[PDB]
Design an enzyme around this catalytic site. Structure first.
Site, short mmCIF file in Angstrom:
data_model
loop_
_atom_site.label_atom_id
_atom_site.label_comp_id
_atom_site.label_asym_id
_atom_site.label_seq_id
_atom_site.Cartn_x
_atom_site.Cartn_y
_atom_site.Cartn_z
N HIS A 84 -5.08 -1.28 -4.67
CA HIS A 84 -5.64 -0.15 -3.93
C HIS A 84 -6.40 0.74 -4.89
O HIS A 84 -5.92 1.01 -5.99
CB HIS A 84 -4.55 0.60 -3.15
CG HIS A 84 -3.86 -0.28 -2.17
ND1 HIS A 84 -2.77 -1.05 -2.51
CD2 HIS A 84 -4.17 -0.62 -0.89
CE1 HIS A 84 -2.41 -1.79 -1.48
NE2 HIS A 84 -3.24 -1.55 -0.49
N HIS A 119 -8.47 -1.01 0.11
CA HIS A 119 -7.50 -2.10 -0.03
C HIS A 119 -8.26 -3.35 -0.39
O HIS A 119 -9.29 -3.63 0.21
CB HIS A 119 -6.80 -2.41 1.30
CG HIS A 119 -6.08 -1.26 1.93
ND1 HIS A 119 -4.73 -1.28 2.19
CD2 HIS A 119 -6.53 -0.07 2.39
CE1 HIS A 119 -4.37 -0.15 2.78
NE2 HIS A 119 -5.45 0.60 2.91
N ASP A 155 -2.76 -8.01 -4.83
CA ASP A 155 -3.16 -6.81 -4.12
C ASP A 155 -3.63 -5.73 -5.08
O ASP A 155 -3.27 -5.71 -6.25
CB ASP A 155 -1.96 -6.32 -3.31
CG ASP A 155 -2.34 -5.38 -2.18
OD1 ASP A 155 -3.53 -5.22 -1.83
OD2 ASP A 155 -1.39 -4.80 -1.63
N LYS A 208 -12.42 -4.26 7.87
CA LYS A 208 -12.25 -5.24 6.80
C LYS A 208 -13.49 -6.09 6.61
O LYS A 208 -14.09 -6.54 7.59
CB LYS A 208 -11.10 -6.21 7.12
CG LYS A 208 -9.94 -5.65 7.90
CD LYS A 208 -8.86 -6.71 8.08
CE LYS A 208 -9.26 -7.80 9.07
NZ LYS A 208 -8.16 -8.76 9.35
N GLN A 227 1.05 -11.41 -3.02
CA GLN A 227 -0.32 -10.99 -2.79
C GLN A 227 -0.94 -10.45 -4.07
O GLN A 227 -0.30 -9.66 -4.78
CB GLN A 227 -0.31 -9.90 -1.72
CG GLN A 227 -1.66 -9.52 -1.16
CD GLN A 227 -1.50 -8.54 -0.01
OE1 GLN A 227 -0.67 -7.63 -0.07
NE2 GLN A 227 -2.29 -8.73 1.04
N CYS A 246 0.81 -1.22 0.00
CA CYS A 246 0.00 0.00 0.00
C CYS A 246 0.85 1.27 0.00
O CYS A 246 0.61 2.15 -0.82
CB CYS A 246 -1.00 0.00 1.17
SG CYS A 246 -1.15 -1.57 2.08
N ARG A 298 6.80 -11.80 5.75
CA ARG A 298 6.36 -11.73 7.12
C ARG A 298 7.30 -12.61 7.92
O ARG A 298 7.50 -13.77 7.55
CB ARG A 298 4.94 -12.27 7.23
CG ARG A 298 4.30 -12.05 8.58
CD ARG A 298 2.80 -12.21 8.52
NE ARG A 298 2.17 -11.85 9.79
CZ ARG A 298 0.85 -11.78 9.99
NH1 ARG A 298 -0.01 -12.07 9.02
NH2 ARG A 298 0.39 -11.43 11.19
C1 LIG Z 1 -5.28 -6.29 0.86
C2 LIG Z 1 -4.03 -5.48 1.17
O1 LIG Z 1 -4.05 -4.25 0.45
C3 LIG Z 1 -3.89 -5.16 2.66
N1 LIG Z 1 -2.89 -4.14 2.89
C4 LIG Z 1 -3.54 -6.43 3.44
O2 LIG Z 1 -2.49 -7.01 3.35
O3 LIG Z 1 -4.53 -6.78 4.26
C5 LIG Z 1 -4.58 -8.17 4.69
C6 LIG Z 1 -5.56 -8.30 5.83
C7 LIG Z 1 -5.45 -7.22 6.91
C8 LIG Z 1 -4.09 -7.10 7.56
C9 LIG Z 1 -3.73 -8.30 8.41
N2 LIG Z 1 -2.29 -8.37 8.70
C10 LIG Z 1 -1.83 -8.05 9.95
N3 LIG Z 1 -0.60 -7.99 10.31
C11 LIG Z 1 0.35 -8.27 9.33
C12 LIG Z 1 1.70 -8.16 9.68
C13 LIG Z 1 2.67 -8.42 8.72
BR1 LIG Z 1 4.48 -8.21 9.22
C14 LIG Z 1 2.31 -8.79 7.42
CL1 LIG Z 1 3.51 -9.20 6.23
C15 LIG Z 1 0.98 -8.89 7.07
C16 LIG Z 1 0.00 -8.63 8.03
C17 LIG Z 1 -1.42 -8.70 7.66
O4 LIG Z 1 -1.83 -9.04 6.57
ZN LIG Z 2 -3.21 -2.49 1.38
#
Ligand SMILES: C[C@@H](O)[C@H](N)C(=O)OCCCCCn1cnc2cc(Br)c(Cl)cc2c1=O
Ligand SMILES: [Zn+2]
Ligand SMILES: C[C@@H](O)[C@H](N)C(=O)OCCCCCn1cnc2cc(Br)c(Cl)cc2c1=O
Ligand SMILES: [Zn+2]
Lengths: 401, 401
Positions: free
Chosen positions: A145, A271, A143, A225, A141, A94, A123
Site C-alpha cells: 500500500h 493498493h 501486497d 481496480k 500475497q 491493508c 479465504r
Molecule cells: C492488492 C491488495 O492490496 C488488495 N487489498 C487486494 O487483495 O485486492 C485484490 C483484488 C480486489 C479484491 C477482490 N477480492 C474480493 N473479495 C475477497 C474476499 C476475500 Br474473504 C478475500 Cl481473502 C479476498 C478477496 C479479494 O481479493
Molecule cells: Zn489492499
C-alpha cells in the site's frame, strides 16, 4: 504435459492433502523456489523504494466491521474466538498497514510512504472450487500500500504500472491484457470519490498507451481496480496484478498526516499486488517452464560429476568452489555410467551438468552440458563460474549458448 | 535502558494493539532485524545439513486428535470451521513435518532426515499474561524435526548441541546452563527405551564436554529432553534451546521407512529449537544490547551526512557506493547542524555516522563517528567500506576501533 500438480510431485516441490484443503506444504525444493521468488520481489521493493512490514495474522471482528470487510466478505472469512471476542483470520493486509501508518505522527515529508508485505491471507472458498495451486484457501500475497497526497497519485500509480510490466517481463510474459473495474453496486465512499478514483486510473492507462476495456460494476467495494492479465506459452489467460485507488479506508481508520499548509489531511491509499500470490504464480511458472526453471529459480543449479573415483577429489574441490560463488550445487560421485548420471539430473531439470574426466583434472577445466542436451565442451573452471554467476545474478531466462 | 518495550517504541521496531492481542505489528526496522535473524539461522541450516520447508497455518482437528496432544492442549488452540469441518490453527510444526515425511516412500538411506521451518504458530494464551515480544500469541520458532534410526540419535543430538553453542556464541552468550529432564511417572515406551534415550542425551553432552544437571521426572510422556538456558549481561536466565526425543508421534501419525533388512520401521523423532520464539529472542537481544544491535543486525547500519550543502553530491556518491556494497545505508542531507544529525542517529543507535566536510571531499576520504561517541578520524572510503563489509559478514559483536 506441463501440469504443475504432476511436476510438483515429480520434482518434490510441494503437496496438498485433504486435512488442509487448498493449503500448500512446501517441500525443500519447492520452498527454495518460493524463497528465490521472495528474494526477487525484495530486490524490486528495494529498487522501487518500498518498506517491508509484517502484520498480525488475525484481528478483532470489530475492526473488520469498521473497515467494511465484514459487511462485504463475512461468509468468505475464517473466524476464531478467544475470551468472548471474535477474530477474523486476515483476508487482506491493508488494515494492518494502516495500523502501522497510524503509529507515530506523519507529515508530508514521509509521503509517498510505500509499505509492502508478503501477506499470509486466507479465504474460506467453497472446497469444491479449489484446484492445484491456482485456486487456494491459504496464500501469500505480494501486497503493498502506498500512502500519498492527491498530487502524488499520478506519479505513484505510474510507478506501480511500471513495476507490473517490469516484473512480468522477468519471467518472459510480454502479452498482457488490461481491464479497468469501476464502482460496484455495493460499495463504500461517495460518488465524487469514485469519479476521481476512476478518472485517475483511466488517465494512467491513457498516458502509458495501455489499451483497456471497462469492466462495469466489478470494482472492489473500497475502490476501482486496474486488473492485469498475463498470457502463458499455451495462450492461457491468468489474471495476476491489480492496482487500486482507495479514498475510503484511510478515512475510516483515522489515518492522517500534517500537510505543507499545516492542515491535518487524510492520505490517499494505492493498493497493489503484481504476482497475485506466491503460490499461484509458482503454479503458473511451473507450467510455463514445464519444470525447466530459469537457472536463478532452479532448486539445484549445478551437478558436478566424476567418471571414476580418480576425479573424486577434483569434483569435491570444484563443488566447494561453486558453493563459494553462491551456486546451489551438489557432487555426484556414484559408480554409475556417465549417461546414467546425466539422465538422472536432466530428468530433475538441473540446468548444468559439470563433468570431470582425467583430461579436465589435468587442464583445470570442466566439461559442461545443459539440460536441453547442448554440449558446451571443456571450459576453464573460472570462466564457467563467472558465466554461471552472471546468468544467476541477472536472472536470465537463457542458458549459455 | 534495557526495556525492550520502550526501546521497541523508540527505534520504531514494532507495536501492539488490543485488536490483535499478542500478535506483533512489525515495522520496517523491526522486520529488518527479524529478517536478518532468519538469514543467520538459514546459514546454520546450510552448515548443519537441514532441509527447509513450509507448512500451512491450519489442519483438520481430526488429525490433531491423533497426535496425543489434543486433550492436553485443546484449551490453548485457536479453532476455525468451514463446511462442517473444524480446523486448528497450528500451535506447533511437528505434525505438519510428519505429513511432509509421509509423502513418498522413505528408505533408511534418507535418514537422518533433518527438516527445519520458521513455523508461524499461534496459542490462545490468556490476555492477562501477555508481555511485549516475550509472551505472545503469535510466534515463530526456529524449529526443526530430525527423523532418524535409534542408532543415529547420539550423533544427531551431538550435532544439535554443537549448533546451540555455535549460535548462542554469535550473540555473546557464553554462560549456558544445561538440564536433562528424565522419565516422568506417566509415560509411553518401555523402561529400557528410557534407559537408552536418557543415556543418548547424556553421552552426546559428554561428547561436547558439557557439564549438566538433571531435572528429575520432568521429561515429556514421549521422551527425555535437554534444555539450554542462556544468561544475559545482567545475569538473567532465559530458557531458549530444547532438544526433545520423541518415540510417540511417528507411530501415532503412521510414519515409517523401509529398513536395510526390508522391514517396515518407525523412525525416532528429535524436536529441536535453538532460539525458541524469534520474537522473544529479539526481545532478549534488544535488552542484552540496550538497543545497540551489532552492525549485522542493525536496521540502519550507516548514515552518511554532510556538514553543509557543498558536500551533498559527495554524500550521494558515497551513499550509492555503500548501497552497492550491500550495506543498509541512508543519507542525511537535511540543512541541520552536523551535531544535530549525530545526536539524532546516535539516539537511534545507528552503528556508524560517515561525516563529509570539505576536507573529506577534497581528499576522497570520510570521517567516521560511532554511536558510542568515538571519533575514528578521516579514513579512505574504499578501506572503510571493506572494513564494514567484514564486520557485517563475520557478524561481529565489536565495532571498528
Ligand atoms: C492488492 C491488495 O492490496 C488488495 N487489498 C487486494 O487483495 O485486492 C485484490 C483484488 C480486489 C479484491 C477482490 N477480492 C474480493 N473479495 C475477497 C474476499 C476475500 Br474473504 C478475500 Cl481473502 C479476498 C478477496 C479479494 O481479493
Ligand atoms: Zn489492499
Ligand atoms: C522444538 C519444537 O519442535 C517443539 N514441538 C516445541 O514447540 O517445543 C517447545 C517447548 C516444548 C513444547 C511443549 N508444549 C508446550 N506448549 C504447548 C502448547 C500447545 Br497450545 C500445544 Cl498444542 C502443545 C504444547 C506443547 O507440546
Ligand atoms: Zn516439534
Amino acid at each position: 504435459g506441463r501440469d504443475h500438480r504432476k511436476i510438483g510431485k515429480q520434482l518434490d516441490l510441494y503437496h496438498m492433502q485433504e486435512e488442509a484443503p487448498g493449503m500448500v506444504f512446501w517441500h525443500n525444493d519447492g520452498w527454495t523456489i518460493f524463497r528465490e521468488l521472495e528474494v526477487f520481489v525484495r530486490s524490486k521493493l528495494k529498487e522501487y523504494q518500498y518498506q517491508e512490514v509484517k502484520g498480525p495474522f488475525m484481528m478483532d471482528r470489530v475492526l473488520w466491521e469498521k473497515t467494511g470487510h465484514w459487511d462485504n466478505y463475512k461468509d468468505a472469512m475464517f473466524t476464531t474466538s478467544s475470551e468472548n471476542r471474535e477474530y477474523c483470520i486476515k483476508p487482506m493486509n491493508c488494515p494492518g498497514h494502516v495500523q502501522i501508518f497510524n503509529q507515530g505522527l506523519k507529515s508530508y515529508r514521509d509521503l509517498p510512504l510505500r509499505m509492502a508485505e508478503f501477506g499470509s491471507c486466507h479465504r474460506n472458498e467453497p472446497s469444491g472450487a479449489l484446484h492445484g495451486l491456482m485456486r487456494v484457501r491459504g496464500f501469500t500475497q505480494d501486497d503493498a500500500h502506498i500512502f500519498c497526497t492527491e498530487e502524488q497519485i499520478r506519479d505513484e500509480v505510474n510507478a506501480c504500472i511500471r513495476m507490473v510490466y517490469d516484473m512480468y517481463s522477468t519471467f518472459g510474459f510480454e502479452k498482457i491484457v488490461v481491464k479497468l473495474s469501476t464502482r460496484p453496486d455495493k460499495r463504500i465512499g461517495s460518488d465524487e470519490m469514485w469519479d476521481r478514483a476512476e478518472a485517475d486510473l483511466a488517465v494512467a492507462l491513457e498516458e502509458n498507451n495501455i489499451p483497456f476495456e471497462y469492466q462495469l460494476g466489478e470494482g472492489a467495494f473500497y475502490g476501482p481496480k486496474i486488473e492485469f492479465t498475463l498470457y502463458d506459452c499455451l495462450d492461457r489467460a491468468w489474471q495476476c496484478g491489480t492496482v487500486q485507488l482507495d479514498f475510503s479506508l484511510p478515512s475510516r481508520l483515522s489515518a492522517s498526516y500534517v500537510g505543507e499548509d499545516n492542515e491535518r489531511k487524510v492520505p490517499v491509499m494505492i493498493h497493489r499486488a503484481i504476482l497475485g500470490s506466491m503460490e499461484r504464480f509458482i503454479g503458473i511458472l511451473t507450467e510455463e517452464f514445464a519444470g525447466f526453471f530459469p537457472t536463478w529459480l532452479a532448486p539445484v543449479q549445478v551437478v558436478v560429476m566424476n567418471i571414476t573415483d580418480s576425479q573424486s577429489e577434483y569434483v569435491n574441490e570444484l563443488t566447494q568452489k561453486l558453493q563459494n560463488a553462491g551456486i546451489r550445487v551438489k557432487a555426484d560421485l556414484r559408480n554409475e555410467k556417465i549417461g546414467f548420471k546425466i539422465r538422472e539430473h536432466t530428468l530433475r531439470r538441473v540446468p548444468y551438468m559439470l563433468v570431470c574426466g582425467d583430461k579436465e583434472v589435468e587442464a583445470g577445466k570442466v566439461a559442461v552440458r545443459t539440460r536441453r542436451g547442448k554440449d558446451l565442451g571443456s571450459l576453464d573452471v573460472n570462466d564457467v563460474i563467472e558465466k554461471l554467476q552472471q546468468e544467476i545474478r541477472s536472472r536470465s531466462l537463457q542458458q549459455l549458448e
